[PDB]
């Protein structure tokens, strides 16, 4: 059908159809008269997986023969989403499979919707891991993703009476055809026990053993015939475990609970034992695997052969575990072991929010990991000895830089451990990396300036353009060819088409097509009726006070009050769509969802409003819903308080897919505005410097309430029960926080946000100038490819050269 | 190689080799340089499974078109063992697969040893279910086995310091290639709740829901192209289950515990809630499946279309569940529902031991299954109304026949429920069926004589001759052809070869070959050295007081004491092998294992004994060890106290495989001796009548101790610590039971057992007369085919005609 989906040759189609019917019979044990659409999906998944296998085996063999330096990406989260379409895209099989399924009287798009998301992540950090695996395979790096195979991923969100309800994400119920169990590479992980000091050094004894069973998932590069591995560990009890009889067998579940469920907190630390167990489990099993592979090629060459990247502090125990193995088991002396650890490990920091920083109570580590605590104390002593020698007399610096925090309960600062034990520390956007050097890690920067880098985040243009927006990919490919899909900088060639009438028409047509398709999706799957000629105002991301969905709520109520004030005046019609999950224990995030649905209940049923303003809560926001709504979006809301969003990656997905951005100078918004030009971006609100000035004199929200009549009216409506008639006080906690305890200064940005939103409506009234500004955004989105990000990690941290050369098929 | 293993045609071998390499690459994602023997086993298993699929789909389609009467075999136990060799035997693929694997430089026998036993049973009852599925497929019955997919089967037995240790049987660790998950046929099962009485009848409300997910395993018939289904249910929590958040997800394990583990008690009732849950779970899910299939063809025709066979009382709740569905959900009146239930259900009783009878406390049923208890009370009232009308004034009969037992705690007699609710009640050997009518069910027999039948147990000659003893199968097939494998009565043709020198030579040669192979197996796998020219004296079966492994221990010690008394006299050398598992909580059974190993420790290290007497405890006795040891056996020990072994099936396996039997007139021993002639059987000990006479005057063990010097010496040796030097009192519980609390009268049979064992040694000294007696046993074993048993169930209980006609391939 469309060129970027590849060829449908007669031989390929015949062969796919034959293998589809072979899997339906032999694999699924079904004839055509009893097959459900789910059987058809599985037959196709098995058929496409077959094309991966040769390339996967040859790629792993190629890395054994060439023995390049190996990259180990350690994350507690991989937000993969669906695998079927992505595999077809990267193997150029999409048109052939479309043709093959069509000739069997099946619709491939209907079969694609049956696949469960692998929702093994919360949001940005988990999805960044997924984008990275894709870029590492596309750039031909010998890279392995290592994580946990959670039985239950991020919970399914149901809205019930406008409230979030959580259901278990039973994503493995029907089987996962993409994974291969490797029970033969099962490894022991130890917990509890105690330390004996012998003549021959320290001994970790009387431990409980949990087994780590690996599951391998193929990660195909973009048409380069490279297939890398994501290895996820599953917890299994040993068979002597507890071994009255019946209860001992049932108690095996205590050990297997380690890999049962993903902690659903985004940017919030919860010091739970089960979470520390998950962290050690993935680190212990992964480091044994790394060392085993290294010995099958003296530890001086280890850092020439191994890079370990830490996705935040979640796998920070990699540093003490590497020391423990090298000192206790391999009998290297401390200093040599430490040289090897630092040259091997690099640390990516993802937030400055202090509630997100991992600070593990010492009593937890003492009980669960007594040897690691000893090694952490030793690391701290030697580290503070270097601080004292560099800053003699600066006793306050010693307290601030300690890995050990004094107070009510002694805690380990896992970020301090990562900086001490890593040769490189990076933030995830330039403003974030500058804030790390100026504020939270200023002391560490003064000691070791050379360690601190920036690696601005990115997204894979395979999932986030070719896969989710084939219509846009195609009209681009018509003018500048297909090379941009693995070289996104080539999108700059589109700036020479900004005054081309045909290209303007095509860009606007694809947007309209995407909006019609998404409006229909809403009607079928959720019986809701939206005007597809309205501006699609989209804020999708986890529900958090710092992301200021509440600021968006204040704008929506302002538009409502303006319409009711002057019902017969023209306003640009908008559909305001807000979606995202709240962490189950985050009361305020749960109240914000309820406010969004309560506003919708008033706004969507007011006959005076008409189809001029619709407010929709998008339920169960996840990777597969992002692929549908982002190509449909006109306006991207990136409205975090300046200094709180380390980078963001949603911002980039929308820029790539033909939405204009309204945003603060926060995270990667700053670099996006710089790439496109400030004149092609709806920037508003306090900069970082303005927020600091407000903090010095003190944030008084009352001042804004007293001076802005439009704002006072909204707050009185919230308080009085305008939006909750049956429960007049329902939103008293929201009003109370906004007036007295707002860390994120929602009122301070209100006036400038509303005024900037008027400029958006004004430009939307002029379709041609809207579309020309969109072209200027798409054309400058190239920097925000994860291929650029990963090439920067490869050259400046890992010391390996990316390659775009094909392996032989 | 040998004819009964089928043809190895060039095309077949080429095709198997091609599909083996296809599965190794595509299914296992392995090249030949990294493949382990386990990968090779899996490649072959997938290759053979491929040949099942066409026949499985066609057979299920044939039953849909022809709509025959359906047989539902309900059991809590299916003791399947390994599937690979059995599948090859029944598809005639064994020689082709032997050839195919040989040409790839692999040994198929080495690959077969990598398969885990499906140990989803305890012993005889579980293995009888497995033999039956094989016969039902071979006789072309539209039959379904329904059970529980236990995550953990019967525990692996380790011997540590001569003591039994249990380990979890993690049989699914590496995957089960034989099963197909059918998550689309998932069904809800209800527990707890309460009963509302409406105007429109009773309503079971406020229940907890567990899901039953079925796994289908193919059951191939013998070369008839029929493949029946074994459907096993797995427990899954619903996704709203408990749905703070983390703990709700972890608590899903409470519901999934239902299918976690097989209760490891053989002939012992334990009234545990989890066990009652397993019983209801398999019954509820199975009856919904049966009714669904029936509606996809008015309940008058239900018994013309459905037979439900109950494997003991374990699924007795099928009777109240069928009533509950028919009355509460389908709105039939009581009397019609009851007519349908009785005509559908038949009950097989397997024991007379009172500790084996299921008597569920009312408080358990009241809480877990309140509606079933109401229906059971109603059944009891109507049943006792029929008893009172037939036996007016006999108030004692009313108390004895009640489904409800009065006492400390009220209990439901599940056997009484099964007799009341079933059109047929059978025992499992003629003597057992006579004992049911004379003693434990005498009152039920007088009310409904027509219900009571015999169906003498049998074994499948596929697993138990062709598969485990190919050498014997072949020398038989040389003289009388292959037809006997599905018509075992044809073995009578062997009586005309009892004086043929060549056949005598071949029978003795196969036995010798089997003994050499098993002696080597002992050396490799367990570093033990046995004389293969000794008599192989084998007692293998679960460890139980009624099976009198202790009587065998007394004989072994008697031989030891006789050798030590007269060291320089000739005795027929014996290897005494005893094997079996004790239930983990059965103290006495655990002490007996320890006595066996303690005797071995004295006997096997006495230089005066030499290789004249060896005592071996065979560790981890299970179906795959039975396939090795039974063909190696000379003497089969079937030495249960008369009246305790309902049938036995080990007895039959040994008769078929060329061992002579030493046994009591118990269970099927009686019919085996009748088939072969008493002169070709080593019968000893009390008959049932003699045991009754001993009970009337009272069993005084002291009398035997006082009158038999050889016995007194053994008891003094046990007491004094001859067999436990470090712990002189180790066996005081054994001596104490034998002297004062022996329910099974071990001393009463001692003299006759030892004398009969001398007759065995005497006949073994004459190889030609030993082998002629063996031929008389093999030649008369035809009755003990499960094909005969299942044809008798089919004609006299289920009302269907068996068929030996092939489906088209
Ligand atoms: O770099 C990828 C994205 O990371 C997000 C980010 C920062 S901390 C965090 C996170 C995610 C999951 C967590 C689970 C347990 C404890 C702490 C956690 C912190 N996620 C940041 O908030 C985004 O700005 C950024 O784009
Ligand atoms: O008919 C098959 C065989 O059944 C055996 C037999 C009788 S009761 C029983 C059994 C097995 C497992 C059980 C689990 C829980 C509660 C009671 C149970 C009873 N097994 C009998 O003991 C054997 O004689 C007979 O050959
Ligand atoms: C990209 C993505 C995110 C991250 O979005 P931000 O706006 O950067 O917070 C979260 N969830 C999903 C499903 C995503 O695809
Ligand atoms: C046949 C069999 C049994 C039953 O043997 P009995 O001697 O009748 O108790 C028990 N276990 C296994 C493994 C069997 O194969």
Ligand 1: which of A78, A267, A310, A349 to mutate, judged by most atoms within 8 Å of the beta carbon? A267
Three-state DSSP class for B665?
A: coil
CB atoms inside a 10 Å sphere around CB A482 = 17
Distance B267 CA to ligand 2 centre (A): 5
Binding-site residues of A for AMP, please?
A: 31, 64, 292-297
Three-state DSSP class for B427?
A: strand
- Positions of A annotated as catalytic residues are 350, 541-542, 547, 649, 653
Residue the block writes with tokens 């001859």: B722
> How far lies B65's CA from each of B305, B677, B765, B808, in Å?
14, 48, 61, 15
Q: Which residues of B532-560 are buried (b: 16+ CB within 10 A; e: fewer)?
A: bebbbbbbbbbbbbbbbbbbbbbbbbbbb
Protein residue closest via CA to atom 15 of ligand 4: B623
Max distance between CA atoms of chain B, in angstroms, equals 90
Distance between CA atoms of residues A800 and A136, nearest Å: 11
Hey, is the C-beta of A155 within 8 angstroms of any chain B C-beta?
Answer: yes
| DSSP 8-state assignment for residue A780 | T
Tokens linked to B161: 């310091």
Three-state DSSP class for A785?
A: strand
Distance between CA atoms of residues A688 and A670, nearest Å: 11
B38 is in an annotated binding site: no
Residue A329's Cβ-side half-sphere holds a number of Cα atoms within 13 Å equal to: 13
Beta carbons of B363 and B411 less than 8 angstroms apart: no
Scan residues 254-293 of B and list those with Cβ closer than 8 Å to A.
Answer: 257, 260-261, 263-264, 272, 274
Do you know the residue count of chain A?
809
Distance between CA atoms of residues B95 and B351, nearest Å: 41
Distance between CA atoms of residues A535 and B539, nearest Å: 84
Three-state DSSP class for A147?
A: strand
Residue B257's Cβ-side half-sphere holds a number of Cα atoms within 13 Å equal to: 20
Burial of B395 (0-12, 13-18, 19+ CB in 10 A): exposed
Three-state DSSP class for B682?
A: strand
> How far lies B71's CA from each of A247, A294, A364, A701, B101, in Å?
35, 59, 58, 77, 38
| DSSP 8-state assignment for residue B366 | H
Active-site entry in B416, B547, B581, B783 = B547
Q: Do B25 and A57 touch (CB under 8 A)?
A: yes
H/E stretch holding B187 reads strand B187-198
What is chain B's Cα-based Rg? Answer: 27
Scan residues 577-636 of B and list those with Cβ closer than 8 Å to A.
Answer: 584-585
Q: Which of A243, A272, A584 to mutate to test the interface with B (most CBs of B within 10 A)?
A: A243
Where in A59-179 does DSSP place strands (E)? 70-74, 78-81, 118-120, 143-148, 156-160, 163-167
Distance between CA atoms of residues B653 and A440, nearest Å: 77
Three-state DSSP class for A176?
A: coil
Residue the block writes with tokens 């918004």: A669
| DSSP 8-state assignment for residue A425 | E
Distance between CA atoms of residues B260 and B647, nearest Å: 30
Scan residues 46-105 of B and list those with Cβ closer than 8 Å to A.
Answer: 50, 53-54, 56-57, 61
3-state secondary structure B490-517: HHHHHHHHCCCHHHHHHHHHHHHHHHHH
Beta carbons of B227 and B221 less than 8 angstroms apart: yes
Tokens linked to B310: 């109950």
In the annotation, is B569 catalytic?
A: no
Does the CB atom of residue A431 touch ligand 1 within 6 A? no
Tell which residues of chain B come right before a gap with C–N over 2.5 A: 243, 297
What DSSP line would sit under A288-340, residue for residue?
A: HHHHHHHHT---TTHHHHEEEEEETTTTTTHHHHHHHIIIIIT---HHHHHHH
CA angle A162, A598, A686 (to 5 degrees): 110
Distance between CA atoms of residues B440 and B421, nearest Å: 17
3-state secondary structure B752-786: HHHHHHHHHHHHHCCHHHHHHHHHHHHCCCHHHEH
Q: Do A181 and B175 touch (CB under 8 A)?
A: yes
Return phi, psi of residue A267, to 5°.
Answer: 60, 40
Smallest Cα–Cα separation from A514: which of A659, A682, A648, A618? A659
CB-based contacts of B601, cutoff 8 Å, min separation 6: B162, B723
| DSSP 8-state assignment for residue B72 | E
> How far lies B391's CA from each of A59, A110, B382, in Å?
84, 69, 14
Share in percent of chain A as helix, strand, coil (round to 5): 55, 15, 30
| CA end-to-end span of chain A | 25
> How far lies A434's CA from each of A416, A445, A454, A493, A547, in Å?
18, 11, 8, 31, 20
Tokens linked to B126: 């579980």
Distance between CA atoms of residues A319 and A344, nearest Å: 9
Q: Is A8 left (phi over 0), alpha (psi -120 to 50) or beta?
A: beta
Q: With beta carbons under 8 A apart, name residues in chain B contacting A25.
A: 53-54, 57
Distance between CA atoms of residues B394 and B406, nearest Å: 17
CA angle A93, A98, A101 (to 5 degrees): 115
Q: Do A25 and B57 touch (CB under 8 A)?
A: yes
CB atoms inside a 10 Å sphere around CB A89 = 23
Residue A233: strand pairing partners: A148, A214
> How far lies A464's CA from each of A508, A608, A790, in Å?
19, 39, 16
Smallest Cα–Cα separation from B574: which of B629, B607, B620, B537? B537
CB atoms inside a 10 Å sphere around CB A527 = 7
Three-state DSSP class for A761?
A: helix
Distance between CA atoms of residues B135 and A61, nearest Å: 49
CB-based contacts of B420, cutoff 8 Å, min separation 6: B319, B379, B380, B383, B403
Q: Which residues of B287-320 are buried (b: 16+ CB within 10 A; e: fewer)?
A: bbbbbebeeeeebeebbebbbbbbbbbbbbbbbb
Nearest chain B Cα distance for residue A245, angstroms: 7
Distance between CA atoms of residues A491 and A497, nearest Å: 11
Q: Which domains occur in chain A, in start order?
A: 1-458+786-809 (3.40.50.2000), 459-785 (3.40.50.2000)
Three-state DSSP class for B318?
A: helix
Beta carbons of B147 and B571 less than 8 angstroms apart: no
Three-state DSSP class for A58?
A: helix
Distance between CA atoms of residues A139 and A133, nearest Å: 10
CB atoms inside a 10 Å sphere around CB A472 = 23
Distance between CA atoms of residues A700 and A694, nearest Å: 9
- Quick one: resolution in A? 2.3
Three-state DSSP class for A695?
A: helix
Q: Crossing angle, helix A37-66 and helix A10-22, to 10 degrees?
A: 110
Alpha-carbon dihedral angle through residues B749, B754, B756, B762, given to the nearest 10 degrees: 180
Residue the block writes with tokens 């005509």: B343
Nearest chain A Cα distance for residue B54, angstroms: 8
Tokens linked to A636: 């991207």
CB atoms inside a 10 Å sphere around CB A636 = 29
Beta carbons of A414 and A313 less than 8 angstroms apart: yes
Distance between CA atoms of residues B101 and B349, nearest Å: 45
Alpha-carbon dihedral angle through residues B123, B125, B127, B131, given to the nearest 10 degrees: 160
Burial of A542 (0-12, 13-18, 19+ CB in 10 A): buried
| CA end-to-end span of chain B | 25
Distance between CA atoms of residues B438 and B424, nearest Å: 17
Does the CB atom of residue B462 touch ligand 4 within 6 A? no
Tell which residues of chain A come right before a gap with C–N over 2.5 A: 243, 297
Burial of B62 (0-12, 13-18, 19+ CB in 10 A): middle
Q: Crossing angle, helix A334-344 and helix A370-390, to 10 degrees?
A: 90
Tokens linked to B699: 């069993």
Residue the block writes with tokens 């600021």: A551
What is chain A's Cα-based Rg? Answer: 27
Distance between CA atoms of residues A747 and A750, nearest Å: 5
| DSSP 8-state assignment for residue A199 | T
In the annotation, is B529 catalytic?
A: no
CA angle B264, B265, B270 (to 5 degrees): 115
Distance between CA atoms of residues A506 and A720, nearest Å: 49
Smallest Cα–Cα separation from A718: which of A592, A586, A577? A592
Q: With beta carbons under 8 A apart, name residues in chain B contacting A236.
A: 173
Where in A350-449 does DSSP place strands (E)? 359-361, 404-405, 411-413, 424-427
> How far lies B36's CA from each of A185, A186, A798, B119, in Å?
12, 14, 34, 24
> How far lies B427's CA from each of B308, B441, B461, B542, B646, in Å?
16, 11, 22, 20, 8
Distance between CA atoms of residues A717 and A721, nearest Å: 6
Distance between CA atoms of residues B410 and B400, nearest Å: 14
Name the experimental technique.
X-ray
Scan residues 191-250 of B and list those with Cβ closer than 8 Å to A.
Answer: 216, 236-237, 239-241, 243-246, 248-250
Residue B744's Cβ-side half-sphere holds a number of Cα atoms within 13 Å equal to: 19
Q: Which residues of B728-752 are buried (b: 16+ CB within 10 A; e: fewer)?
A: eebbeebbebbbeebebbbbbbbbe
Distance between CA atoms of residues A42 and A25, nearest Å: 12
Residue B236's Cβ-side half-sphere holds a number of Cα atoms within 13 Å equal to: 24
Do you know the residue count of chain B?
809
Alpha-carbon dihedral angle through residues A458, A464, A465, A466, given to the nearest 10 degrees: 120
Ligand at minimal distance from the CA of A653 is 3
């Amino acid at each position: 059908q469309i060129s970027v989906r590849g060829l449908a040759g007669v031989e390929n189609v015949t062969e796919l159809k034959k293998n589809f019917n072979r899997h339906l019979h032999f694999t699924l044990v079904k004839d055509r008269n009893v097959a459900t659409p789910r059987d058809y999906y599985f037959a196709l998944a098995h058929t496409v997986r077959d094309h991966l296998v040769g390339r996967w085996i040859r790629t792993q063999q190629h890395y054994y023969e060439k023995d390049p330096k190996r990259i180990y990406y350690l994350s507690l989260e991989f937000y993969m989403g669906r695998t079927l379409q992505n595999t077809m895209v990267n193997l150029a099989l999409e048109n052939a499979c479309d043709e093959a399924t069509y000739q069997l009287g099946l619709d491939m798009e209907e079969l694609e919707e049956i696949e469960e998301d692998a929702g093994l992540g919360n949001g940005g950090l988990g999805r960044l891991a997924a984008c990275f695996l894709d870029s590492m395979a596309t750039l031909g790096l010998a890279a392995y993703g290592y994580g946990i195979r959670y039985e239950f991923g991020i919970f399914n969100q149901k809205i019930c009476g406008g409230w979030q309800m959580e259901e278990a994400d039973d994503w493995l119920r029907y089987g996962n055809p993409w994974e291969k169990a490797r029970p033969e590479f099962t490894l022991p992980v130890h917990f509890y026990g105690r330390v004996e000091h012998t003549s021959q050094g320290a001994k970790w004894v009387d431990t409980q053993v949990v087994l780590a069973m690996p599951y391998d998932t193929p990660v195909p590069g973009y048409r380069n015939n490279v297939v890398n591995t994501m290895r996820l560990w599953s917890a299994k009890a040993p068979n002597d475990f507890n071994l009255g009889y019946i209860q001992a067998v049932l108690d095996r579940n205590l050990a297997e609970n380690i890999s049962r469920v993903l902690y659903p907190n985004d940017n919030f630390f919860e010091g739970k034992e089960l979470r520390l167990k998950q962290e050690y489990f993935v680190v212990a099993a992964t480091l044994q695997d790394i060392i085993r592979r290294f010995k099958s090629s003296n530890f001086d060459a280890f850092p020439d052969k191994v890079a370990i990247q830490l996705n935040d502090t979640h796998p920070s125990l990699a540093i003490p575990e590497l020391m423990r193995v090298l000192v206790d088991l391999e009998r290297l002396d401390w200093d040599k072991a430490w040289e090897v650890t630092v040259k091997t490990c690099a640390y990516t920091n993802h937030t400055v929010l202090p509630e997100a920083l991992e600070r593990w109570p010492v009593h937890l580590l003492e009980t669960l990991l007594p040897r690691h605590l000893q090694i952490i104390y030793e690391i701290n002593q030697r580290f503070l000895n270097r601080v004292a020698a560099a800053f003699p007399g600066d006793v306050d610096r010693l307290r601030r830089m300690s890995l050990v925090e004094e107070g009510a309960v002694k805690r380990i600062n896992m970020a301090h451990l990562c900086i001490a034990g890593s040769h490189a520390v990076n933030g995830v956007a330039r403003i974030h990396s500058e804030i790390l050097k100026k504020t939270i890690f200023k002391d560490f920067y003064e000691l070791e300036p050379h360690k601190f880098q920036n690696k601005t985040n990115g997204i894979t243009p395979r999932r986030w353009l070719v896969l989710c927006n084939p219509g846009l990919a195609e009209i681009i490919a018509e003018r500048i060819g297909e090379e941009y899909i693995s070289d996104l900088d080539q999108l700059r060639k589109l700036l020479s088409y900004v005054d081309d009438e045909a290209f303007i028409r095509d860009v606007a047509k694809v947007k309209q097509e995407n909006k019609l398709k998404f409006a229909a999706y809403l009607e079928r799957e959720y019986k809701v009726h939206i005007n597809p000629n309205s501006l699609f105002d989209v804020q999708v991301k986890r529900i958090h006070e710092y992301k200021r969905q509440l600021l968006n709520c204040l704008h929506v109520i302002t538009l409502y009050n303006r319409i009711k004030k002057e019902p017969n005046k023209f306003v640009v019609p908008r559909t305001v769509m807000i979606g995202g999950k709240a962490a189950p224990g985050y009361h305020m995030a749960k109240m914000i969802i309820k406010l969004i649905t309560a506003i919708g209940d008033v706004v969507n049923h007011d006959p005076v409003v008409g189809d001029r303003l619709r407010v929709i809560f998008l339920e169960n926001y996840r990777v597969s819903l992002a692929e549908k709504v982002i190509p449909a979006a006109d306006l991207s809301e990136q409205i975090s308080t300046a200094g709180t969003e380390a980078s963001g990656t949603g911002n980039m997905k929308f820029m790539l897919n033909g939405a204009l951005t309204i945003g603060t100078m926060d995270g990667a918004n700053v670099e996006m505005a710089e790439e496109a030009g400030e004149e092609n971006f709806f920037i508003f609100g306090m900069r970082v410097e303005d927020v600091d000035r407000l903090d010095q004199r003190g944030y008084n929200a009352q001042e804004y309430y007293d001076r802005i009549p439009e704002l006072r009216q909204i707050i009185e409506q919230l308080s009085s029960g305008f939006f909750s008639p049956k429960q007049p006080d329902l939103f008293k906690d929201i009003v109370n926080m906004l007036m007295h305890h707002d860390r994120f200064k929602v009122f301070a940005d209100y006036e400038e946000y509303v005024k900037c939103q008027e400029r958006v409506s004004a430009l939307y009234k002029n379709p041609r100038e809207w579309t020309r500004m969109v072209i200027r955004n798409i054309a400058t989105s190239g920097k925000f490819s994860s291929d650029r990000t990963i090439a920067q990690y490869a050259r400046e941290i890992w010391g390996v050269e990316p390659s775009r050369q094909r392996l032989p098929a």
